[PDB]
């Protein structure tokens, strides 16, 4: 019967796809306890045009009238500085998401993190419009050449100098290292923020998923349902991520990277789709971690305050002022999330018990 | 055509299962270029009795009369020193294979490698009978307690102290660290063999698979068909394995760990079966590596000489004196291996090119 008032919760890294999948999962943002969602653009084809991002947002709002949607473009050679200014001036986007080519779902149209300079006109326009640059910070794999090989376990660490160069070259650009998975990345974000004294001083932040606070390599070795990018790494990495999430620092906040796939796309003998589905119980998953760490006092900062501050979400843009309330009523995660038609998704931690449930309080 | 006479080739780590799968796969030992096969025992139930291992060998010999079968027991709670002596004296087994409990396929009846002491009477009997102790050298994963976490990436390295203690405590026992996957393991096998002058000096050997000479973690992360145990690890590990395989050292030789699974046991969202199926093109896979490494002169040692020497295979045990001839005919690995009934297997490197092919020639002398 214990309750925690989390206010206007934020999930700053959401995939809702299109079609019937989108109709199934978009109402789960609210059901999982999230008021505000930052919507990723890696559709097929990626979202790179104004009319597409406008229609997509209106489609989400039709499906969930109480959810606040922040939208993004997919970083691509199709983008122009003029397009960035137009989209920003119409409040059609809040940021631009960068996928390195080949590293994850629908990243074939993505970029080379060896030649980010080709997108400096875009970053310049984003900086002028106070838009956020979201990075999938993994270098593409390479096992040859003059250089130490890059593989799924060190690809994030190998990306960190690209992060530092972007922050150096665009010091007023807000940049997010999305879904951090390595101890090395946590330390880099902390070191970048060494001189920050209030939350509004943060320019470079990192999001943390629910599933990387639980998983290590042992959990997805043999279990495609736990396979995502960046891959869950070693116990020392998991410990560093959990310490960061409960740290109370303004430069870490919640982004689930909830990535829904129909079960048949996870049960492949080759080319398994990467992604973990956590939307249905997003805030309860996080509460489990914060309870185990005796850090529930810091839950609201991680899932509400810090994301709102970083994205400068105004009360005038919220779709609903309802507050998310956690209450300590145990529940069992179902085996599947289904639309009763052709889509079944296996949820993260299917079959496990969670100590907290989430409801909504007006005003 | 360029040809290499590989003679009596051996694959010292073979799974052929039972029933219809066995009927499909056992003929592929010969088709893949292998004369001598060491047959692993992790059946359901595991092979732990004399009559079972005798009847199993008879089944295999019927399916492949020209293949030489060396048999093993599974290291289980039920094994007794008297049974080791009995099976050895009847030439019913050449060794005993140890699976750490829970680490891989049909390992639930296996051991705790943290307390091997309960099996020391078995190892003493094996040592007296000159039987080989085959180790799946991985410690089971542990994430609780206060000691070192163990996970799929360091479980082999974590096992290496256990290997050294067994070698120290049973210095005359032939021991194989099966399917090595880590640079750490290669270094340990190399240092155990620091003072070895000829092949017959080797007491502790290691087998290397075909697929660990190709694969890294990147290749199985989203590809269940490439998932096996021990998992393929980092590029630095694969570098060490390939260098060991072409080293010409007598303490490394070929064991495929070819592990057939029906495709439906790989296309799972959880509990993907561990194992790569390499039998159908076993020797051509290895030839690919030795060619790319410019070490084809060392191929015969890796796939024939060293395994025959370590297991002390005699001409009198040999089911057929046919010689395996590698010839430089490019070929394309199929997408599926099937029996035309209910079984389809995805072979290793399905769809790829191989520079070599294999055929058989009689001994005419
Ligand atoms: Zn991503
Ligand atoms: Zn994502
Ligand atoms: Zn094994
Ligand atoms: Zn095996």
Residue the block writes with tokens 């009198």: B316
Contact A2, A328 (CB under 8 A): yes
- For residues B110 and B41, the answer to whether their CB atoms sit within 8 Å is no
Q: For residue B174, give the nearest of B121, B114, B132, B115 by alpha carbon.
A: B132
**Cα-based distances in Å from B251 to A97, B189, B289:** 52, 8, 18
First vs last Cα of chain B: how many Å apart?
24
The interaxial angle of helices B183-192 and B155-169, nearest 10 deg, is 10
Alpha carbon distance A213, B335 (integer Å): 39
Question: Residue B157's domain is classified under what CATH number?
Answer: 3.20.20.140
- CB-based contact (8 Å) between B145 and chain A? no
Q: How far is CA B318 from CA B55, B75, B305, B321, in A?
A: 19, 26, 14, 7
A130-154: burial string, b at 16+ Cβ within 10 Å, e else: ebbbbbbbbbbbeeeeeeebbbbbb
The residue written with tokens 């590029």 in the block is: B235
Strand partners, A252: A206
Tallying the residues shown for chain B, one arrives at 365
- Which residues lie across from A174 on neighbouring strands? A132
Query: In 3D, which of A151, A131, A127 has the Cα closest to residue A141?
Result: A151
3-state secondary structure chain A: CCEEEEECCEEEEECCCCHHHHHHHCCHHHHCCCCEEEECCCCCCCCCCHHHHHHHHHHHHHHCCCCEEECEEECCCCCCHHHHHHHHHCCCCCEEEECECCCCCCCCCCECCCCHHHHHHHHHHHHHCCCEEEECCCCCCECCCCCCCECCCCHHHHHHHHHHHHHHHCCCCEEEECCCCCHHHHHHHHHHCCCCCCHHHCCEEEEECCHHHCCCHHHHCCCHHHCCCCCCCCHHHHHHHHHHHCCCCCCEEECCCECCCCHHHCCCCCCCCCCEECHHHHHHHHHHHHHHCCCHHHHHHHHHHHHHHHHCCCHHHCCCCCEEEEECCCEECCCCEECCCCCEECECCCCCEECCEEEEECC
Minimum-distance CB partner of A269 among B221, B224, B231 = B224
Distance CA B152, CA B103 (A): 9
- Asked if A181 is an interface residue toward chain B (Cβ–Cβ < 8 A), one would say no
A225: contact with B, CB 8 A cutoff: yes
Chain A contact for B161, CB < 8 A?
no
Name the residue facing A227 among B143, B221, B271 (closest C-beta): B221
By the 10 Å C-beta count (0-12 exposed, 13-18 middle, 19+ buried), B59 is classed as: middle
Cα gap A169→B295, rounded to integer Å: 49
Query: Contacts of residue A143 in chain B, CB cutoff 8 Å?
Result: 216, 218, 235
What's the CA gap between B362 and A256, in Å, rounded? 64
- Burial bucket for residue A167 (CB in 10 Å: 0-12, 13-18, 19+): middle
The beta-carbon neighbor of A266 closest among B141, B234, B269 is: B269
Is A346 touching B (CB cutoff 8 A)? yes
The count of other CB atoms within 10 Å of the CB of residue A236 is: 12
Q: Quick check: bond before B45 cis, omega within 30?
A: yes
Residue A243 φ/ψ, nearest 5 degrees: -60, -40
Contact of A70 with A97, CB cutoff 8 Å: no
Give the CA distances from residue B346 to residues A254, A306, B64, B293, in Å, rounded to whole numbers and listed in that order.
Answer: 40, 49, 22, 27
Distance CA(B181)–CA(B245), nearest Å, equals: 12
The answer to whether B143 contacts A269, with C-beta atoms less than 8 Å apart, is: no
What are the beta bridge partners of residue A133? A96, A175
Residue whose C-alpha is closest to residue A98's, from A84, A118, A82, A112:
A112
Q: Is B214 on the interface with A (CB under 8 A)?
A: no
Closest to A99 in 3D by CA, of A124, A70, A72, A121: A72
Contacts 24+ apart (CB under 8 A), B192-197: B192/B164, B192/B167, B192/B251, B193/B249, B193/B251, B196/B250, B196/B251
Nearest alpha carbon to residue A78 among A121, A40, A38: A121
Report CB contact under 8 Å: B227, A221: yes
Rounded CA separation B185/B137 (Å): 9
Say if CB A244 and CB A180 are below 8 A apart.
yes
User: What does DSSP say about strands A344-345 and B3-7: parallel, antiparallel, or unpaired?
Assistant: unpaired
Residue B191, C-beta contacts closer than 8 angstroms, at least 6 positions apart: none
The B357-361 sheet, strands edge to edge: B3-7, B323-327, B357-361
A234 Cα: distance to centroid of ligand 4 (angstroms) = 26
Residue found by looking up tokens 């190892």 in the block: B123
Count Cα neighbours of A75 within 13 Å in the Cβ-side half-sphere.
29
B222 touches chain A (CB under 8 A): yes
**B351: phi then psi, degrees, rounded to nearest 5:** 90, -10
Please name which of B132, B94, B141, B133 lies closest in space to residue B116, comparing C-alpha atoms: B133
Q: How far apart are CA A345 and CA B218, in angstroms?
A: 25
Q: Cα separation of B249 and B205, whole Å?
A: 10
C-alpha triplet A356, A357, A359: angle, nearest 5°: 140
Whole-angstrom Cα distance, residue A234 to residue A121? 38
Does residue A270 sit at the B interface (CB-CB below 8 Å)?
yes
Ligand nearest to the CA of B11: 4
Query: Which chain A residues are closer than 8 Å to B151 by Cβ?
Result: 216-218, 234-235
Question: Residue B174: phi, psi to the nearest 5?
Answer: -70, 125
CA–CA min distance B56, chain A (Å): 30
- For residue B357, the cross-strand partners are B327
Burial B72-90 (b: 16+ CB within 10 A, else e): bbbbbeebebebbeebbee
The answer to whether B235 contacts A149, with C-beta atoms less than 8 Å apart, is yes
* Contact call for residues B12 and B38 (beta carbons, < 8 A): yes
User: Which of these, B203, B161, B212, lies nearest to B183 by C-alpha position?
Assistant: B212
Cα nearest neighbour of B228 on chain A: A222
- In angstroms, the CA B205 to CA B193 distance is 9
Radius of gyration of chain A (CA): 19
Q: Judge whether B321 and B361 are in contact, CB under 8 Å.
A: no
Which ligand has an atom closest to residue A99 CA?
1
B15 annotated binding-site participant? yes
Query: What is the CB-side half-sphere exposure of residue A78 using CA atoms within 13 A?
Result: 14
Nearest-Cα distance to chain B for A152, in Å, is 6
A267 to B263: CB separation less than 8 angstroms, yes or no: no
Method: X-ray
Q: ∠B236-B242-B243 over CA atoms, to 5°?
A: 90
The shortest C-alpha distance from B79 to chain A (Å) reads 30
Distance A257 CA to ligand 2 centre (A): 4
In total, chain A counts a number of residues equal to: 363
Is the separation of the CB atoms in A155 and A103 below 8 Å? yes
3-state secondary structure chain B: CCEEEEECCEEEEECCCCHHHHHHHHHHHHHCCCCEEEECCCCCCCCCCHHHHHHHHHHHHHHCCCCEEECEEECCCCCCHHHHHHHHHCCCCCEEEECECCCCCCCCCCECCCCCHHHHHHHHHHHHHCCEEEECCCCCCECCCCCCCECCCCHHHHHHHHHHHHHHHCCCCEEEECCCCCHHHHHHHHHHCCCCCCHHHCCEEEEECCHHHCCCHHHHCCCHHHCCCCCCCCHHHHHHHHHHHCCCCCCEEECCCECCCCHHHCCCCCCCCCCEECHHHHHHHHHHHHHHCCCHHHHHHHHHHHHHHHCCCCHHHCCCCCEEEEECCCEECCCCEECCCCCEECECCCCCEECCEEEEECCCC
- Could you identify the residue written with the tokens 């999430």? A245
Range of the domain at A271: 3-361
Both tokens assigned to B24: 């499909």
Q: Are B322 and B362 in contact (CB under 8 A)?
A: yes
Contact A223, B270 (CB under 8 A): yes
A252 touches A206 (CB < 8 A): yes
The token duo for A167 is 């922050």
Whole-number Å distance between alpha carbons of A100 and A116: 10
Whether A151 and B270 lie within 8 Å, measured CB to CB: no
Partner-chain contact A143 B234, CB within 8 Å: no
Sole residue written with tokens 């998991």? A238
Q: Do B143 and A235 touch (CB under 8 A)?
A: yes
Contact (CB<8Å) B222/A272: yes
Which of B150, B235, B345, B349 would best serve as a mutation to test chain A binding (most A beta carbons within 10 A)?
A: B235
Where on the phi/psi map is residue B114: left (φ > 0), alpha (ψ -120 to 50), or beta?
Answer: alpha
Angle, helix B235-245 to helix B282-292, in steps of 10 degrees: 100
**Rounded Cα gap, residues A350 and A354, in angstroms:** 11
Q: Does residue B185 contact residue B160 with C-beta atoms inside 8 Å?
A: yes
Residues with Cβ < 8 Å from B93, sequence gap 6 or more?
A: B53, B71, B72, B73, B87, B131
Count up the domains in chain A and report the number: 1
Buried b (16+ CB within 10 A) or exposed e, B103-126: bbbbbebbbebeebeebeebbebb
Q: Which residue of B has its CA nearest to A235?
A: B149
Q: Compute the distance between CA of residue A287 and CA of residue A278 in angstroms, rounded to an integer.
A: 13
Parallel, antiparallel, or unpaired: how do β-strands B132-135 and B95-98 relate? parallel
């Amino acid at each position: 019967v214990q309750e925690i008032d989390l206010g206007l919760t934020c999930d700053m890294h959401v995939h809702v796809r299109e079609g019937a999948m989108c109709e199934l999962v978009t109402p789960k943002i609210r059901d999982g306890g999230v008021s505000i969602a930052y919507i990723m653009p890696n559709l097929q084809p990626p979202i790179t045009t104004l009319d597409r991002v406008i229609e997509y947002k209106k489609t989400l709002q039709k499906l969930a009238p109480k959810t606040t949607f922040l939208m993004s473009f997919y970083l691509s050679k199709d983008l122009t500085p003029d397009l960035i200014h137009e989209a920003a001036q119409q409040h059609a986007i809040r940021g631009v998401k960068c996928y390195p080519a080949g590293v994850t779902t629908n990243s074939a149209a993505g970029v080379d993190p060896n030649d980010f300079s080709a997108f400096y006109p875009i970053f310049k326009a984003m900086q002028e419009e106070n838009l956020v640059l979201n990075l999938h910070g993994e270098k593409p794999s390479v096992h040859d050449g003059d250089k130490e090989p890059i593989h799924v376990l060190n690809a994030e660490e190998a990306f960190l100098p690209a992060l530092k160069k972007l922050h150096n070259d665009f010091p007023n650009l807000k940049i997010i290292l999305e879904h951090c998975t390595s101890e090395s990345a946590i330390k880099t974000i902390e070191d970048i923020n060494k001189n920050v004294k209030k939350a509004t001083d943060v320019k470079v932040a990192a999001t943390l998923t629910a599933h990387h606070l639980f998983l290590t390599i042992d959990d997805w070795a043999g279990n495609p349902v736990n396979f995502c990018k960046p891959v869950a790494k070693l116990p020392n990495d998991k410990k560093a991520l959990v310490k960061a999430a409960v740290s109370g620092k303004p430069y870490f906040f919640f982004g689930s990277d909830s990535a829904p796939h129909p079960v048949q796309n996870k049960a492949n003998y080759e080319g398994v789709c990467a992604g973990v589905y956590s939307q249905s119980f997003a805030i309860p998953y996080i509460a489990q971690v914060f309870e185990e760490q005796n850090a529930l006092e810091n839950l609201k900062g991680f899932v509400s305050d810090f994301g709102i501050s970083f994205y400068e979400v105004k009360d005038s843009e919220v779709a609903s002022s309802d507050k998310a309330i956690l209450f300590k009523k145990e529940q069992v995660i179902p085996q599947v999330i289904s639309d009763g038609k052709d889509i079944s998704i296996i949820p993260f931690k299917a079959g496990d018990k969670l100590s907290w449930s989430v409801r909504w309080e007006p005003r």
